[model samples]
Target chain A: TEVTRAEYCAIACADIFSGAGEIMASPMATLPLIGARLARLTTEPDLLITDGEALIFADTPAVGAKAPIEGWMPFRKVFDVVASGRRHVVMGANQIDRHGNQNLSAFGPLQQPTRQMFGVRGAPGNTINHPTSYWVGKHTSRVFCDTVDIVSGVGYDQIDPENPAYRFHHLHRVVSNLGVFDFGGPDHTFRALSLHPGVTADQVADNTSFEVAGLADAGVTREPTDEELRLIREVLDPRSLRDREVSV
Target chain B: VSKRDKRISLDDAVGELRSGMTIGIGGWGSRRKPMALVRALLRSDVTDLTVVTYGGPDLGLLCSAGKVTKAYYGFVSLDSAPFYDPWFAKARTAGEIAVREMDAGMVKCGLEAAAARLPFLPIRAGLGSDVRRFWGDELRTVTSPYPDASGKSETLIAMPALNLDAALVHLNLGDKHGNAAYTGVDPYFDDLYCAAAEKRFVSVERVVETEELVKTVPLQNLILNRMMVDGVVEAPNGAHFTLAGDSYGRDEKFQRHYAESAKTPQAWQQFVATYLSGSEDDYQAAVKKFAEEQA
Candidate 1:
């Protein structure tokens, strides 16, 4: 049962897969559940899917039979691979604003650039013109602010639909610990689409900056059923929630 | 000396240089310097040149290109792809290039000493083992007048001043008189070398009038009277082929190709044919050609 949701999610977001069997085997595939859901809701899987290192075809049993791609790839290459237009990726963000602009450079201006939490590795290109999705482990007013100190990557309002340079924004999604959302409407502002189990519409409203669009009645998210939870907890991250708590 | 008295090109300054010349380059581990001239120097027949620089792409590229005989620097790494220059490491390990490693702060002080026309500056830099191995005993030992609790004398290390035959530097803008301004992040060691060198060559991204430079907040005013700068070259985006201070973005394709293709001589030749061999006078042309080839 756990294997079913894993396969379902994997196959759904297959549009963003690099077809590089090694990447699929790495930990990168774990965060794109929203991309997976989007794919399942919107398009059909027409490419290969793999768990092991094997190069598996779309309709075949030889997918998870081989070893994964060896060695470490720098974060920049990961951006390029996804930007090449064949894979969807999940990017973790400390803070995300109403415009979808992400910040990872510094907390302040250039000269007195506040102590940088993390260097701007690929955040600029990642959000600018790619099928980017953000996942937040924790959400707060400071984390989800009205405006970021620096706009490392632009989001909905920054994307010009008619502009070829920003066409990738069409595939943007935002997922949090609480629920899943999508950038909708002509402006593509973030609109509340779904809620996690035990979350309220008012709670979601209190957290975000822009007004929630199409707020649905309060309800639990289609919980990753026992099987979904099993795949997310076991196959994806063996250590489960405990893994995220460990400080380096 | 005035703008009217200066030479017109970098080639003129290069022609003035002889073999076994000591050169000071202003940069730190590959940030804020003109590397195009360095690459151009490699193609010249100059040999036995001692170069002083902050360890970065300039040092690594020159060492890798087999043009440098000796180099003084603090650190080097080809960790980031495209920015990672591999030749520095290979040359060091193979003994193709002589490396004199000094403390980073000492390198700065050495340049400052030269700028101030001092013989040497006493410092606590390079206090531990092996730092003395390269710079020598005079640089390693220090005599402090103040004594410890036991009345024993305090000892400190000394860094030798770097006086150079010429210093080649880049600026965002400049005037005919050799006055220059840096637009991006402040350049640290460049102005120091410009003041220290007997002759200085200025490469300005944009050459402007004296009034224009005067109106702006000057990042580093080297007090460069016309006599100090022997030549000024308007090499717009001269730092494009290499890293600049965020003014021009890097050529990722070229770097990736260099890393992937430089493994063999034939591949390197191919890269040369595509990138190096062609005559693209400015960075725009270079970028266009490289982008067209998807390099």
Candidate 2:
């Protein structure tokens, strides 16, 4: 089947899952892979999918069999859960300017800012420890600016080199709507790994604020295999992906 | 004034006390009360002394001393410390201290009523089941004799008033003339008790000139007036034995210390010998020595 550039690009990023064992549904699944991952932590997968109040897991018992989980656990409990050695959390940035400061809190200059969003809630602790990842929904010159209002979460420079703290250094990957990227070897500069199916290397470079590390080859992301598509369709979500294709 | 004319001695303060007299004490869950006076009272021949207080170190020491015959309180809670006073609980259940539990708000209202010089103050403090169950007999609803044009009488509930023979207050500073000023957070129930009681005795950390006290603490309301107070005794760091905020950052330290060191007769005896038997000066010296050693 001769798929369009956007269609093939969207399909390639679709069936991905986060460490907390939640799969992103489509429309949302089409959202920058990084944004989808960050959303999974905040948004309950069961409520987002069912919308019936009751959660209906395919292999689990009947919908109303269990007591519903409500409210975020105490701030201390959330911090303790993350600090308890082996958990993985996905974070995001509204603006990741050149200096590697990820700003999800504010926009514009410090003194006279245009829009002041919710300032760093737990992003400091979220970035300080455990394995962290990022997702950027929009990949543009404005969104990827020269500087950010605040560094809600730290990136590569903060991580120690000698006795590198896993908390600081372990930023695994950053997935954007445009492509997949990773921090370049010791210097920690972000380098492009793969472009979404038909997106050019030049476009990805032009959009990024930081210097592209090493060779600037624009490799096409591998298409989702039949097994991956099956997981995305049957288990993760069938309805939302159907809506995505029809709407697009 | 001569020592004989003064009510400075613990013996004199505890002298006029008799059996079954209602005694109101100022302290919150054992933060401040002259434990020396409490100890002196325990040594006296008085029995069945009905004790009123906001449960704290005073209550614990009294219970340990086996002096309190009855106890009145809103509630007993220990912050950051195990407040399970097994002795008090045991005494209450065994019919030793006739337990009269009142709501904390009602206790405050009762104190306020006494302080305000009102015959009785109508209050909604005991709106819940807990207060009703405990003080039901004391609470009465009265109908107004004069009726309205419609011939309907006005209904009112009269809460029983608390009349105390004497109230004991512990403070940061005082004058020989019985005027006292509290340095820390103003105690809620203490001032009320001082105003309400027939007689009030104040234990202070230091006794300064009346002028010095006025200059140091400019706030006039913080000092219980000389007219209301009958006696003043210098009892420096008297609140140390108790778990008041300034003396200790938290009540947990005293709670744990008491649990470990004050549970048995032998431990209690050792604690008294080490800390309580000495005069206030001696205790201060011992504490200073300990601090220097640690340093």
In model 2, the runs with Cα more than 4 Å from the true position are A1-248, B1-7, B117-119, B142-157, B243-255, B276-295
Q: After superposition, how far is residue B152 of candidate 2 from its true place, in Å?
A: 9.7
TM, every model: 0.52, 0.49
How far residue B105's Cα lies from its native spot in candidate 2, in Å, is 1.1
Candidate with the greatest lDDT versus the true structure: 1
Q: Per model, state how many residue pairs clash.
A: 10, 5
Docking class of 1: incorrect
Off by over 4 Å in 1: A1-248, B1-7, B82-84, B148-150, B218-228, B278-284
Candidate by candidate, in order, the iRMS in Å equals 22.9, 28.9
